[PDB]
């Protein structure tokens, strides 16, 4: 499955605005 | 406040 | 949704809106995990305490979007239920124990840049993701206040909060099959979820493979954005097996 990726972010590579907010909140 | 929906949803 | 921002296009391709055909308005928020399937809280279908209870007949889904009100032509697909499916232990009348439900829709919809299933976590992806601290997303077309509406979808993130701090908020029951999210009055920042929200997924990103899973379903709260009070959200990964169950027929 392609579940979870988004054609217009992970399948760009490219981030949203605040995506990373989460990624640093995963200590 | 919604716009219209097309007939053919019903 | 209280605190938040407009969504970035295509950022939530999994958001659903539950749509009541007659008056034509906002019902709820769900989300998309097959091609067929729309997972959403019982109590947007079911409340008897409101005199809610919804056929499959009388809503559609609206795929797709992001503006609230304005058809989305080209970029929007509305669909038809075929069967909706409430948890049979779904508990209306204490606390929305179990509030969760599935519905198939007529015909499959067509993915695009727009529309995209999010995944539904694994035990491993569940015990890794669902940890006090770590932060989710939280989506939807609901109240920018307890007591406005948007012109387009919102997001919050908000980090998940200790089981203790969880039942110390409220006189309501928690139980396992839910989970509570929100900062704390000392944090500063602020959010949540609030009425027309309910339905709606709670994301979170794994580090391990880049995609995102949907660990809640925007279930419950008392007001919304108060101090001290946090959101409440159905356990997903607690419910899988019925969910499997369903979709396995
Ligand atoms: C708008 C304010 N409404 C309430 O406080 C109703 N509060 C009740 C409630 O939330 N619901 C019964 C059906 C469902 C509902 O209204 N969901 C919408 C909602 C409300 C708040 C939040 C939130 N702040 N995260 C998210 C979704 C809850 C009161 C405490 C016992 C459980 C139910
Ligand atoms: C809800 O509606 C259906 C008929 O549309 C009915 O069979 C059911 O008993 C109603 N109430 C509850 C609480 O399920
Ligand atoms: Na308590
Ligand atoms: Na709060």
């Known amino acids: ?27 | 406040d919604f716009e219209e929906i097309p007939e053919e949803y019903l | 949704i209280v605190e938040g921002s407009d969504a970035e296009i295509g950022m939530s391709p999994w958001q659903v809106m539950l749509f009541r055909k007659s008056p034509q308005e906002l019902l709820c928020g769900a989300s998309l995990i097959s091609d067929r399937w729309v997972l959403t809280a019982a109590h947007c279908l079911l409340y008897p305490p409101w005199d809610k209870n919804f056929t499959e007949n009388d809503l559609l889904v609206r795929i797709g979007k992001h503006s609230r009100t304005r058809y989305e032509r080209n970029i929007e697909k509305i669909s038809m239920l075929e069967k909706i499916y409430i948890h049979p232990r779904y508990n209306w009348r204490e606390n929305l124990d179990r509030d969760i439900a599935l519905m198939k829709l007529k015909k499959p919809v067509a993915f695009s840049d727009y529309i995209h299933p999010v995944c539904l976590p694994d035990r491993e992806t569940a015990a890794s993701l669902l940890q006090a601290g770590y932060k989710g997303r939280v989506t939807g077309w609901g109240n920018l206040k307890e007591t406005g509406q948007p012109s387009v979808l919102q997001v919050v993130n908000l980090p998940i909060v200790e089981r203790p701090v969880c039942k110390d908020s409220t006189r309501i029951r928690i139980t396992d099959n839910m989970f509570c999210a929100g900062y704390k009055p000392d944090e500063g920042k602020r959010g949540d979820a609030c009425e027309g929200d309910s339905g709606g997924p709670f994301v979170m990103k794994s580090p391990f493979n880049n995609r995102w899973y949907q660990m809640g379903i925007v279930s419950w709260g008392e007001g919304c954005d108060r101090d001290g009070k946090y959101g409440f959200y159905t356990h997903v990964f607690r419910l899988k097996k019925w969910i499997q169950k369903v979709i396995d027929q």
């Open chain 1, 1 to 27: 499955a392609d579940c979870g990726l988004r054609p217009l972010f992970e399948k760009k590579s490219l981030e949203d605005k605040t995506e990373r907010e989460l990624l640093e909140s995963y200590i």
